[PDB]
Design a binder for this molecule. Structure first.
Ligand SMILES: Cc1cn([C@H]2C[C@H](O)[C@@H](COP(=O)(O)OP(=O)(O)O[C@H]3O[C@H](C)[C@@H](O)[C@H](N)[C@H]3O)O2)c(=O)[nH]c1=O
Ligand SMILES: Cc1cn([C@H]2C[C@H](O)[C@@H](COP(=O)(O)OP(=O)(O)O[C@H]3O[C@H](C)[C@@H](O)[C@H](N)[C@H]3O)O2)c(=O)[nH]c1=O
Ligand SMILES: Nc1nc(=O)c2c([nH]1)NC[C@@H](CNc1ccc(C(=O)N[C@@H](CCC(=O)O)C(=O)O)cc1)N2C=O
Ligand SMILES: Nc1nc(=O)c2c([nH]1)NC[C@@H](CNc1ccc(C(=O)N[C@@H](CCC(=O)O)C(=O)O)cc1)N2C=O
Ligand SMILES: [Cl-]
Ligand SMILES: [Cl-]
Lengths: 273, 274
């Protein structure tokens, strides 16, 4: 049918590197169109620009309106900023990679919400897009650890890495329309919206050491913000299993020593600045 | 031996039934003391009264001050209302059964917090009392399901049942002093205080059906409160696998039909239904 076979919509190194993989291995420029996010400035920053890569490689920049009527197009969202409505499209070949182990942690801020809710693991999930937010049927998932001292930033860079890999693992079956999927369960399903998360976190210290530590590290993502204790930004939290007494809080020039209601030692390292 | 070998401190069916078990199998009345909770008025209601049981069975009622200097006393807290300081006690035989699968859900309101945090299971844990809240070394634990439609009240009655069972299972080894324990992990440890739970819950509907349903049923405990939707008290929530559309909300005479962002059917039953 159409010249155009695939649309990559989204941002950051997962979208750029997945687009590069399709251009190298599957489709020529003239067979691909791209929809960057509204905030893409067309320059590289701490992630690469999808808009810049597409323009550099002669791939057309399009709008959703411009692709709705393309028969059989593969629409692939990789951190795309718009919620689509499936009945706009002639094609039913609509796919997304979501940065959580669905059915948990639908919605936004998924580098914060699993840590803040005390998880030991997260995942990336390739799924069909339906009209709900991260609700469509699951094609593949890869779960991986949230290590004990990982921050939100560390978790995000794992999503980028594992998300790119799950794209490469599954894309041929998507192209060939040969994949299998399974509906999501009602149980374990959870969802967080922007209004659920205050990005300026105020720590509750009447909590376990593990909870105070998770509260701190869930907000460490320096490109956006760092959590603040007594007007100092915190760059790293370290949780040990050493008991130091209950409810410790002491400030030093370079760090705080903290424990919660169970008394395990936390070192909260101040940003050097 | 002082005369007094054991103190049962606390309340409700677990304290009464455990006391009754001790009196039947291990110690006579004149070897036991009790410290009821401050709110025990000696009346059997939806729970049995430990004060009433002790009075009816000639078991002395005491204060903590009265038992601190008692050598070798077994002190057993079963829903006891006072945080003890261990250095007050000559004895080191100090035990509690906590209504959670420790190390999770230390603190209070443990029939609310696991449901509200989307758990599929909970537990009872027998542990040594240390100076922290529910922090001491674990002796035994029994985990059991939170069934999908269980309310906070249903979970509390399961804690009472499994707690009484874990008491009977372990009491021989406590009396022998042959029990084994293990320190708690830092990992997975969680804690909720009274301030963390608003008992008049306002539901966040911009949530999955599982989360809306957990928000409703975590507060269903009619002796205390029921959650209110559109000025109606709710007595039961039922969560189904059936997709009915995203973000459904409809009020009927006897119930609401609700779904969250994933579209699964909830029936929230009003108290007024006949
Ligand atoms: C905007 C922002 C983000 N972050 C962190 C935490 C967040 O998980 C991570 C990535 O932010 P993002 O790129 O804005 O996306 P988010 O994780 O909220 O993902 C959501 O939005 C994107 C655009 C959707 O495609 C995705 N499916 C959603 O989950 O950066 C912060 O810590 N502070 C911030 O202010
Ligand atoms: C006071 C109260 C209680 N409840 C429910 C929820 C709570 O888990 C259950 C039992 O209440 P409780 O007997 O006050 O005890 P709680 O579960 O908070 O347990 C705590 O306090 C008791 C006294 C301690 O020994 C125990 N180790 C603590 O966990 O009843 C309510 O729903 N609303 C209330 O207002
Ligand atoms: N239909 C659809 N389903 C999806 O699963 C999906 C899409 N489109 N499009 C790409 C991506 C979009 N991800 C998102 C997720 C949330 C917001 C957002 O603005 N959330 C608002 C709540 C919006 C609402 O209630 O309608 C917020 O305040 O959190 C935007 C983009 N995606 C899957 O990743
Ligand atoms: N030392 C000790 N450890 C325990 O683990 C323990 C005891 N005593 N005593 C019996 C029982 C007591 N349980 C409790 C638990 C919390 C509160 C309470 O009032 N909590 C307050 C916070 C108190 C504080 O911060 O100091 C709250 O507002 O939630 C009371 C009794 N118990 C284990 O079951
Ligand atoms: Cl964005
Ligand atoms: Cl009480």
């Amino acid at each position: 049918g159409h010249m155009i076979k695939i649309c990559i919509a989204g941002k950051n190194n997962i979208a750029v590197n997945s687009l590069q993989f399709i251009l190298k291995n599957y489709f020529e420029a003239d067979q691909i169109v791209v929809i960057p996010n509204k905030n893409d400035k067309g320059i590289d920053s701490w992630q690469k620009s999808l808009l810049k890569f597409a323009l550099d490689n002669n791939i057309k920049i399009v709008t959703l309106d411009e692709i709705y009527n393309i028969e059989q197009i593969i629409f692939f969202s990789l951190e795309f900023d718009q919620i689509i409505k499936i009945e706009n499209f002639k094609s039913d070949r609509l796919f997304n990679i979501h940065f959580s182990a669905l059915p948990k942690y639908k919605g936004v801020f998924t580098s914060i919400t699993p840590i803040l809710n005390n998880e030991l693991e997260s995942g990336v999930t390739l799924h069909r897009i339906d009209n709900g937010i991260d609700t469509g049927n699951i094609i593949d998932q890869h779960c991986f650890p949230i290590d004990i001292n990982d921050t939100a930033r560390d978790l995000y860079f794992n999503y980028l890495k594992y998300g790119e890999s799950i794209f490469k693992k599954n894309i041929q079956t998507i192209i060939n329309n040969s994949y299998k999927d399974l509906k999501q369960t009602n149980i374990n399903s959870s969802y967080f919206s922007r209004k659920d998360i205050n990005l300026v976190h105020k720590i509750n210290f009447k909590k376990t050491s593990f909870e105070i530590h998770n509260q701190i590290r869930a907000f460490i993502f320096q490109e956006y913000q760092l959590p603040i204790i007594n007007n100092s930004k915190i760059i790293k939290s370290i949780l040990a299993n050493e008991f130091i007494g209950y409810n410790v809080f002491e400030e030093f020039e370079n760090y705080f020593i903290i424990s919660g209601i169970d008394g395990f030692k936390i070192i909260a390292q101040k940003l050097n600045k």
